[PDB]
Design a protein around this ligand. Structure first.
Ligand SMILES: *[C@@H]1O[C@H](CO)[C@@H](O[C@@H]2O[C@H](CO)[C@@H](O[C@@H]3O[C@H](CO)[C@@H](O)[C@H](O[C@H]4O[C@H](CO)[C@@H](O)[C@H](O)[C@@H]4O)[C@@H]3O)[C@H](O)[C@H]2NC(C)=O)[C@H](O)[C@H]1NC(C)=O
Lengths: 295, 125, 18
């Protein structure tokens, strides 16, 4: 048993059928010593007496809010949650598997530049009694500061009664160093609580590996056609340092790979010129396409 | 000074060879402004990093089972790293995980040095 | 240990003798 927040404790249980629980000794936090009784949830049944209570936490019926009383005087509270370990693997029932990139991806994170800011998102099919808590740091040996906002709902898909929810969060590294080669990874930790079930998720990464630039801006055509564009506004600066390479595509395909901000290709009827961007010196993700009618 | 254009080419060949431990950190002055103010300091830290990678590339680390193939691009890294080094200043069972971490680390290192050579060729030359 | 393809990919593991 260990303390999540104040008066909130997590009990680790191997969800083996007919397994033993954990022997837990709750203590009433009060100067009183006599006439103490214990109850659980909205029930009036006394489960024991004394300044301390001992319980065998095996199932979710043993979890929840324990209150200790002196008659009608309410004294203190203790919330118990369970962390399930089935097959030796902590439970991952609150979050859904996004399946991309790897298989068991519950948290997906992404950056648009080297500033130290990034966004993580995740998916769930749970609509009630759901709480998320997000923390982050660079390195475990000495946690260097990363500030995270609060997880907020960003998308939902409803198919009758099956509703799927997407939460996102934004984080920013305190003393970021955009040009430096990162030696330690960023860890993002997400606590997920659903009723009395506690889970947590962690994703470890380098900013350079989650880079996905914004699409090229100001895609323009000039016939003599000269295709011209500019760096996205959100890409790191100076561009002579944080260089981008581009892929220009013609499709009703012809592809041209250039480090330059302009290129020349032929234009067919009812075709389209599309450009995407990528970090020139590190194979990051390709940007999304910017397109314009071949006309 | 160090003929930035040639450094750009040798570093670009390193990037391409790698896409198939020393680190450039903040205090190294390899940021854009740090290049302008003291390019000697940054290129000194790059050089020492390349020398260190050369040594790893020829060690008991890249020998043994699973054996390195002669066609492998990994086998050409020691070459490209050594050329750039002159241009500046003229493991029992699972070796597999450590070879990986070294290669992924070298992609990150060469990416930063390439930005250095690109930026110095555009501003310091 | 050729199952490394499921840990580092088929391109990286193609560098070694199995
Ligand atoms: C994600 O979930 C995992 C699964 O539970 C969780 O791992 C647990 O973390 C807690 C938090 O530290 C560990 O609890 C510790 O247990 C050791 C016994 O080995 C204690 O010595 C520790 O002492 C602290 O707390 C005491 C009272 O609670 C204090 O007296 C003391 O001064 C310390 O403050 C602490 O209790 C627990 O052992 C692990 N479980 C496992 C299996 O490792 C993990 O922390 C979760 N992630 C996050 C970000 O919360």
């Amino acid at each position: 048993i260990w303390e999540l927040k104040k008066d909130v404790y997590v009990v680790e249980l191997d969800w083996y059928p007919d397994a033993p629980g954990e022997m837990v000794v709750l203590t009433c936090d009060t100067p009183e010593e006599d006439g103490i009784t214990w109850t659980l949830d909205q029930s009036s049944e006394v489960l024991g007496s004394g300044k301390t209570l001992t319980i065998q936490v095996k199932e979710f019926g043993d979890a929840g809010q324990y209150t200790c009383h002196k008659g009608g005087e309410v004294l203190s509270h203790s919330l118990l949650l369970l962390h399930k370990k089935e097959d030796g693997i902590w439970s991952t029932d609150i979050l859904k598997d996004q399946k991309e990139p790897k298989n068991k991806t519950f948290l997906r994170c992404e950056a648009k530049n080297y500033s130290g800011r990034f966004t993580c998102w995740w998916l769930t099919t749970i609509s009630t009694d759901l709480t998320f808590s997000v923390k982050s740091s660079r390195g475990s040996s000495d946690p260097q500061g990363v500030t995270c906002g609060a997880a907020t709902l960003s998308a939902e898909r409803v198919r009758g009664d099956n509703k799927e929810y997407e939460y996102s969060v934004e984080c920013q590294e305190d003393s970021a160093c955009p040009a430096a080669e990162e030696s330690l990874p960023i860890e993002v930790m997400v606590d997920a609580v659903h009723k009395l079930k506690y889970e947590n998720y962690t994703s470890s990464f380098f900013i350079r590996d989650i880079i996905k630039p914004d699409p090229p801006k100001n895609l323009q055509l000039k016939p003599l056609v000269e295709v011209s564009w500019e760096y996205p506004d959100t890409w790191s600066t100076p561009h002579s340092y944080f260089s981008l390479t581009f892929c220009v595509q013609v499709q009703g395909k012809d592809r041209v790979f250039t480090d330059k901000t302009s290129a020349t290709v032929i234009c067919r009827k009812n075709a389209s010129i599309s450009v995407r961007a990528q970090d020139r010196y590190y194979s990051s993700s390709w940007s999304e396409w910017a397109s314009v009618p071949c006309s | 000074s160090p003929a930035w254009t040639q450094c750009q080419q040798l570093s670009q060949k390193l990037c391409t060879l790698a896409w198939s431990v020393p680190h450039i950190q903040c205090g190294d002055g390899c940021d854009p402004q740090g290049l302008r103010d003291n390019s000697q300091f940054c290129l000194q830290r790059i050089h020492q990093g390349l020398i260190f990678y050369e040594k790893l590339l020829g060690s008991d680390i890249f020998t043994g089972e699973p054996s390195l193939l002669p066609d492998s691009p990994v086998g050409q890294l020691h070459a490209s790293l050594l050329g750039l080094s002159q241009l500046l200043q003229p493991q029992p069972w699972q070796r597999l995980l450590l070879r990986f971490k070294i290669l992924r680390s070298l992609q990150a290192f060469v990416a930063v040095a390439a930005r250095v050579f690109a930026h110095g060729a555009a501003t310091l030359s | 240990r050729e199952r490394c393809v499921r840990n580092y990919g088929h391109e990286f593991c193609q560098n070694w003798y199995w």
